[PDB]
Design a protein around this motif. Structure first.
Motif, PDB file in Angstrom:
ATOM      1  N   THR C   1      12.071   0.949  21.882  1.00  0.00           N
ATOM      2  CA  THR C   1      11.633   1.268  23.271  1.00  0.00           C
ATOM      3  C   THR C   1      12.829   1.168  24.234  1.00  0.00           C
ATOM      4  OG1 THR C   1       9.531   0.180  22.682  1.00  0.00           O
ATOM      5  CG2 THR C   1       9.835   0.763  24.987  1.00  0.00           C
ATOM      6  N   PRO C   2      12.998   2.167  25.118  1.00  0.00           N
ATOM      7  CA  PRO C   2      14.100   2.179  26.094  1.00  0.00           C
ATOM      8  C   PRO C   2      14.164   0.890  26.903  1.00  0.00           C
ATOM      9  CG  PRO C   2      13.085   4.290  26.071  1.00  0.00           C
ATOM     10  CD  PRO C   2      12.206   3.406  25.208  1.00  0.00           C
ATOM     11  N   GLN C   3      15.365   0.557  27.354  1.00  0.00           N
ATOM     12  CA  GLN C   3      15.623  -0.648  28.137  1.00  0.00           C
ATOM     13  C   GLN C   3      15.957  -0.263  29.581  1.00  0.00           C
ATOM     14  OE1 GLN C   3      16.080  -3.509  25.824  1.00  0.00           O
ATOM     15  NE2 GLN C   3      15.915  -4.971  27.521  1.00  0.00           N
ATOM     16  N   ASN C   4      16.314   1.000  29.792  1.00  0.00           N
ATOM     17  CA  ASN C   4      16.662   1.487  31.118  1.00  0.00           C
ATOM     18  C   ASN C   4      16.456   2.997  31.214  1.00  0.00           C
ATOM     19  OD1 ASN C   4      18.837   2.601  29.741  1.00  0.00           O
ATOM     20  ND2 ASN C   4      20.402   1.795  31.123  1.00  0.00           N
ATOM     21  N   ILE C   5      16.628   3.536  32.419  1.00  0.00           N
ATOM     22  CA  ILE C   5      16.445   4.963  32.665  1.00  0.00           C
ATOM     23  C   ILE C   5      17.387   5.854  31.844  1.00  0.00           C
ATOM     24  CG2 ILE C   5      17.909   5.046  34.777  1.00  0.00           C
ATOM     25  CD1 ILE C   5      16.023   7.036  35.940  1.00  0.00           C
ATOM     26  N   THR C   6      18.663   5.472  31.725  1.00  0.00           N
ATOM     27  CA  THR C   6      19.637   6.286  30.972  1.00  0.00           C
ATOM     28  C   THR C   6      19.260   6.488  29.489  1.00  0.00           C
ATOM     29  OG1 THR C   6      21.342   5.442  32.493  1.00  0.00           O
ATOM     30  CG2 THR C   6      22.106   6.728  30.654  1.00  0.00           C
ATOM     31  N   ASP C   7      18.863   5.412  28.825  1.00  0.00           N
ATOM     32  CA  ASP C   7      18.480   5.514  27.429  1.00  0.00           C
ATOM     33  C   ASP C   7      17.195   6.308  27.291  1.00  0.00           C
ATOM     34  OD1 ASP C   7      20.670   3.874  27.189  1.00  0.00           O
ATOM     35  OD2 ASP C   7      19.499   2.094  26.636  1.00  0.00           O
ATOM     36  N   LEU C   8      16.278   6.130  28.235  1.00  0.00           N
ATOM     37  CA  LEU C   8      15.014   6.860  28.223  1.00  0.00           C
ATOM     38  C   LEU C   8      15.313   8.349  28.377  1.00  0.00           C
ATOM     39  CD1 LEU C   8      11.767   5.951  30.105  1.00  0.00           C
ATOM     40  CD2 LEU C   8      12.726   8.276  30.181  1.00  0.00           C
TER      41      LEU C   8
ATOM     42  N   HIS E  13      -1.537 -14.988  21.024  1.00  0.00           N
ATOM     43  CA  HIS E  13      -0.421 -15.251  20.129  1.00  0.00           C
ATOM     44  C   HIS E  13       0.759 -14.392  20.562  1.00  0.00           C
ATOM     45  CE1 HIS E  13      -3.565 -16.481  16.937  1.00  0.00           C
ATOM     46  NE2 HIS E  13      -3.028 -17.561  17.479  1.00  0.00           N
ATOM     47  N   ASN E  14       1.962 -14.831  20.224  1.00  0.00           N
ATOM     48  CA  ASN E  14       3.168 -14.082  20.537  1.00  0.00           C
ATOM     49  C   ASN E  14       3.411 -13.934  22.040  1.00  0.00           C
ATOM     50  OD1 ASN E  14       3.019 -11.631  17.727  1.00  0.00           O
ATOM     51  ND2 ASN E  14       2.596 -13.841  17.793  1.00  0.00           N
ATOM     52  N   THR E  15       3.079 -14.954  22.833  1.00  0.00           N
ATOM     53  CA  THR E  15       3.301 -14.907  24.285  1.00  0.00           C
ATOM     54  C   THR E  15       4.151 -16.084  24.773  1.00  0.00           C
ATOM     55  OG1 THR E  15       1.170 -16.024  24.740  1.00  0.00           O
ATOM     56  CG2 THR E  15       1.169 -13.635  24.832  1.00  0.00           C
ATOM     57  N   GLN E  16       4.790 -15.913  25.931  1.00  0.00           N
ATOM     58  CA  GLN E  16       5.621 -16.958  26.538  1.00  0.00           C
ATOM     59  C   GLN E  16       5.665 -16.795  28.048  1.00  0.00           C
ATOM     60  OE1 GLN E  16       9.893 -14.671  25.705  1.00  0.00           O
ATOM     61  NE2 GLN E  16       9.122 -16.216  24.277  1.00  0.00           N
ATOM     62  N   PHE E  48      11.753  -6.447  31.669  1.00  0.00           N
ATOM     63  CA  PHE E  48      10.398  -6.457  31.102  1.00  0.00           C
ATOM     64  C   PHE E  48       9.730  -5.095  31.248  1.00  0.00           C
ATOM     65  CE2 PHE E  48      11.429 -10.583  32.860  1.00  0.00           C
ATOM     66  CZ  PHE E  48      11.184 -11.435  31.809  1.00  0.00           C
ATOM     67  N   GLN E  49       8.826  -4.773  30.326  1.00  0.00           N
ATOM     68  CA  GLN E  49       8.140  -3.498  30.388  1.00  0.00           C
ATOM     69  C   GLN E  49       6.644  -3.667  30.522  1.00  0.00           C
ATOM     70  OE1 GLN E  49       7.228  -1.089  26.821  1.00  0.00           O
ATOM     71  NE2 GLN E  49       7.971  -2.784  25.554  1.00  0.00           N
ATOM     72  N   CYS E  86       3.701 -13.795  32.181  1.00  0.00           N
ATOM     73  CA  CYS E  86       3.255 -14.112  30.826  1.00  0.00           C
ATOM     74  C   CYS E  86       3.629 -12.843  30.076  1.00  0.00           C
ATOM     75  CB  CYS E  86       1.752 -14.357  30.762  1.00  0.00           C
ATOM     76  SG  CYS E  86       1.127 -14.435  29.059  1.00  0.00           S
ATOM     77  N   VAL E  87       4.430 -12.985  29.032  1.00  0.00           N
ATOM     78  CA  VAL E  87       4.873 -11.823  28.286  1.00  0.00           C
ATOM     79  C   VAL E  87       4.725 -11.943  26.774  1.00  0.00           C
ATOM     80  CG1 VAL E  87       6.582 -11.344  30.120  1.00  0.00           C
ATOM     81  CG2 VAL E  87       7.306 -12.578  28.031  1.00  0.00           C
ATOM     82  N   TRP E  88       4.492 -10.805  26.116  1.00  0.00           N
ATOM     83  CA  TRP E  88       4.388 -10.744  24.656  1.00  0.00           C
ATOM     84  C   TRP E  88       5.809 -10.652  24.134  1.00  0.00           C
ATOM     85  CZ3 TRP E  88       0.333  -7.951  27.121  1.00  0.00           C
ATOM     86  CH2 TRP E  88      -0.948  -8.436  26.803  1.00  0.00           C
ATOM     87  N   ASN E  89       6.216 -11.638  23.342  1.00  0.00           N
ATOM     88  CA  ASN E  89       7.568 -11.638  22.813  1.00  0.00           C
ATOM     89  C   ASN E  89       7.752 -10.881  21.494  1.00  0.00           C
ATOM     90  OD1 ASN E  89       6.649 -13.591  20.940  1.00  0.00           O
ATOM     91  ND2 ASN E  89       7.319 -15.261  22.266  1.00  0.00           N
ATOM     92  N   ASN E  90       6.742 -10.123  21.075  1.00  0.00           N
ATOM     93  CA  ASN E  90       6.877  -9.332  19.857  1.00  0.00           C
ATOM     94  C   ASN E  90       7.115  -7.843  20.155  1.00  0.00           C
ATOM     95  OD1 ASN E  90       4.382  -8.374  20.584  1.00  0.00           O
ATOM     96  ND2 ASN E  90       3.339  -8.975  18.687  1.00  0.00           N
ATOM     97  N   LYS E  91       7.667  -7.553  21.334  1.00  0.00           N
ATOM     98  CA  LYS E  91       7.977  -6.183  21.765  1.00  0.00           C
ATOM     99  C   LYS E  91       9.331  -6.234  22.478  1.00  0.00           C
ATOM    100  CE  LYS E  91       4.399  -3.796  20.501  1.00  0.00           C
ATOM    101  NZ  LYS E  91       3.073  -4.090  21.091  1.00  0.00           N
ATOM    102  N   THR E  92      10.070  -5.135  22.444  1.00  0.00           N
ATOM    103  CA  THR E  92      11.376  -5.059  23.110  1.00  0.00           C
ATOM    104  C   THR E  92      11.477  -3.789  23.956  1.00  0.00           C
ATOM    105  OG1 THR E  92      12.762  -6.512  21.687  1.00  0.00           O
ATOM    106  CG2 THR E  92      13.867  -4.629  22.703  1.00  0.00           C
ATOM    107  N   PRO E  93      11.602  -3.938  25.284  1.00  0.00           N
ATOM    108  CA  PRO E  93      11.656  -5.196  26.036  1.00  0.00           C
ATOM    109  C   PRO E  93      10.306  -5.911  25.965  1.00  0.00           C
ATOM    110  CG  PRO E  93      12.480  -3.353  27.324  1.00  0.00           C
ATOM    111  CD  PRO E  93      11.683  -2.788  26.200  1.00  0.00           C
TER     112      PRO E  93
END
Ligand SMILES: CC(=O)N[C@H]1[C@H](O[C@@H]2[C@H](O[C@]3(C(=O)O)C[C@H](O)[C@@H](NC(C)=O)[C@H]([C@H](O)[C@H](O)CO)O3)[C@@H](O)[C@H](O[C@H]3[C@H](O)[C@@H](O)[C@H](O)O[C@@H]3CO)O[C@@H]2CO)O[C@H](CO)[C@H](O)[C@@H]1O[C@@H]1O[C@H](CO)[C@H](O)[C@H](O)[C@H]1O
Ligand SMILES: CC(=O)N[C@H]1[C@H](O[C@@H]2[C@H](O[C@]3(C(=O)O)C[C@H](O)[C@@H](NC(C)=O)[C@H]([C@H](O)[C@H](O)CO)O3)[C@@H](O)[C@H](O[C@H]3[C@H](O)[C@@H](O)[C@H](O)O[C@@H]3CO)O[C@@H]2CO)O[C@H](CO)[C@H](O)[C@@H]1O[C@@H]1O[C@H](CO)[C@H](O)[C@H](O)[C@H]1O
Ligand SMILES: CC(=O)N[C@H]1[C@H](O[C@@H]2[C@H](O[C@]3(C(=O)O)C[C@H](O)[C@@H](NC(C)=O)[C@H]([C@H](O)[C@H](O)CO)O3)[C@@H](O)[C@H](O[C@H]3[C@H](O)[C@@H](O)[C@H](O)O[C@@H]3CO)O[C@@H]2CO)O[C@H](CO)[C@H](O)[C@@H]1O[C@@H]1O[C@H](CO)[C@H](O)[C@H](O)[C@H]1O
Lengths: 103, 103, 103, 103, 103
Positions: C1-8, E13-16, E48-49, E86-93
């Motif tokens: 998943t993209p991290q910023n506008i440029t990569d997207l 689960h998978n949150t922080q 974060f997304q 509160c965020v799911w840490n099993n996704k990037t971002p």
């Protein structure tokens, strides 16, 4: 077709114009069942409501009723001066048909 | 395709551009059956409407009609200067087709 | 998943990034049939559009197109600085795909 | 039809009225599955929720629950003084039924 | 139900919890096919997304997702201090589940 709130108000029975030229004093909103309405008052004590949608409303009014509640809330928070209100006076509190904000 | 409001406006019959370069003077909204519309005014008296959604409108412009009323309300509340209005001149008040706001 | 506008932006065909670091100079919106769009310009003359919804759009882009028009309107009114725009260059004016705003 | 929040609140069982006269201290919003709700707190520690839309809600209240969260978010951001809260007390935190703002 | 963001976050689960106590540094929004999401960052580099809706989301989460994007946008534009996320840490971002704001 009507060019201002007064002409528009004149197209319905049981309506009257209230010239306020003042900001909304209080805003009340309800999510309670059978009472999904909003009530507003002005400093003079005058109270108006946006009616709970019902069978007296045609489908085109559905959207407009929601927009009106949005308008009142934002007029209230920005302290916008409401010029006139066209209301149905066969309801208590009087029911808002249209609003005019000016200056 | 069109790059600006003028070009856009020129793609329809019965339209004309008005250059106001001024903020909206008054805003009127109605939820009254068959009159679910908005009317705006400028200092010089010039009056424009966002038409009641009817048979002259294709499905695609219904959301656009709703968005326009939203645009006019904040434009008003924020005293934003509207540059031009592309309006259909075969209606009274003149009906808003497009709007342009500039710094 | 993209991290910023440029990569997207880099994930798409016919896309391009423009760095503006400036507020929107003009906001234009139309409810005209077949031209339900919004057009924004910057002081440098750059003109971008939010395309009319259609075939080139999947069902998920629908709410997103509407959301982008709301963003552009409020950004314009609040004079928010637009950092970058990811734009499709196979259209004229260039169609907006994404936007980034930084303090 | 009630003319104020006190009277509207009185039309329900398990419903209490709360006079705050302070702006909201915290606003919490969740998109977590089964926990799509909002929670607000006041400096005096008073905590209230806007219920996850459940079966105890009739269809007419659905659009209303959405509006209430919009109202809580904007009143928080603008630091508006909320006067009273009608809350169902057979819930923990107590569930917002209506709200009144009078600054 | 939970009375705060930490308790709520603890129900999955998978949150922080990340305590920011700072305003959003940049807001990114995309209408690009299959990448209809928003990404926010803070000056400390935290990114974060709000996930693109997909199979992992239940029906009740769909308007919550749209609301969260409205919230981030308005918080960003108004420079509202965000307390915790509160965020799911099993996704990037990492994907935003809930947000608390206290100024
Ligand atoms: C007065 C009334 O009872 N109105 C209800 C309405 O009744 C219709 C006719 O009323 C008007 C009106 O509201 O005044 C007539 C207007 O000229 C119309 N104006 C325009 C621009 O179209 C409007 C409008 O069409 C509707 O409101 C659209 O929804 O309607 C009313 O005169 C008529 O009753 C006559 C009857 O025809 C006559 O033979 C008899 O001798 O006397 C009666 C009263 O003069 O009937 C029409 C309906 O058959 O109907 C709507 C439903 O469409 C509502 O019930 C409306 O009540 C008001 O609704 C408001 C919200 O829309 C609000 O709740 C008010 O408090 C309600 O009274
Ligand atoms: C002028 C008119 O009556 N327009 C109505 C429109 O009519 C269609 C054709 O008109 C245009 C137009 O509005 O100018 C032609 C433009 O090039 C089109 N522009 C684009 C970018 O597509 C638009 C557009 O397609 C529509 O507006 C989209 O809905 O339409 C019109 O010229 C044509 O009728 C010809 C006829 O074919 C020809 O044989 C005869 O010699 O001349 C006629 C008139 O010049 O008919 C087309 C429809 O069949 O149609 C729409 C509905 O599709 C509306 O009814 C439109 O009326 C205006 O609508 C506005 C709001 O959308 C507003 O209410 C105005 O007041 C209405 O007059
Ligand atoms: C952890 C996980 O994969 N969660 C996915 C979830 O799974 C369900 C159960 O998970 C929880 C959770 O999300 O943590 C457990 C929580 O305590 C529940 N909390 C509450 C208040 O209800 C939540 C909640 O019900 C759902 O999130 C609502 O949608 O779910 C998980 O324990 C369970 O595991 C079973 C397994 O299915 C079974 O075959 C096996 O025999 O035993 C296990 C018992 O330990 O399965 C549940 C699904 O049926 O499911 C949802 C869809 O319902 C998501 O897919 C969720 O994934 C996360 O979703 C987030 C967005 O919603 C985000 O994108 C994350 O990245 C995803 O991982």
């Amino acid at each position: 077709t009507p060019q201002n709130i007064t002409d528009l108000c004149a197209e319905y029975h049981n309506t009257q114009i209230h010239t306020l030229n003042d900001k909304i004093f209080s805003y009340t909103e309800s999510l309670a069942g059978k009472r999904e309405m909003a009530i507003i008052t002005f400093k003079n004590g005058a109270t108006f409501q946006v009616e709970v949608p019902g069978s007296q409303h045609i489908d085109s009014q559905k959207k407009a009723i929601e927009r009106m509640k949005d308008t009142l809330r934002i007029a209230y928070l920005t302290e916008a001066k409401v010029e006139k209100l066209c209301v149905w006076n066969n309801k208590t509190p009087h029911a808002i048909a249209a609003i005019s904000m000016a200056n």
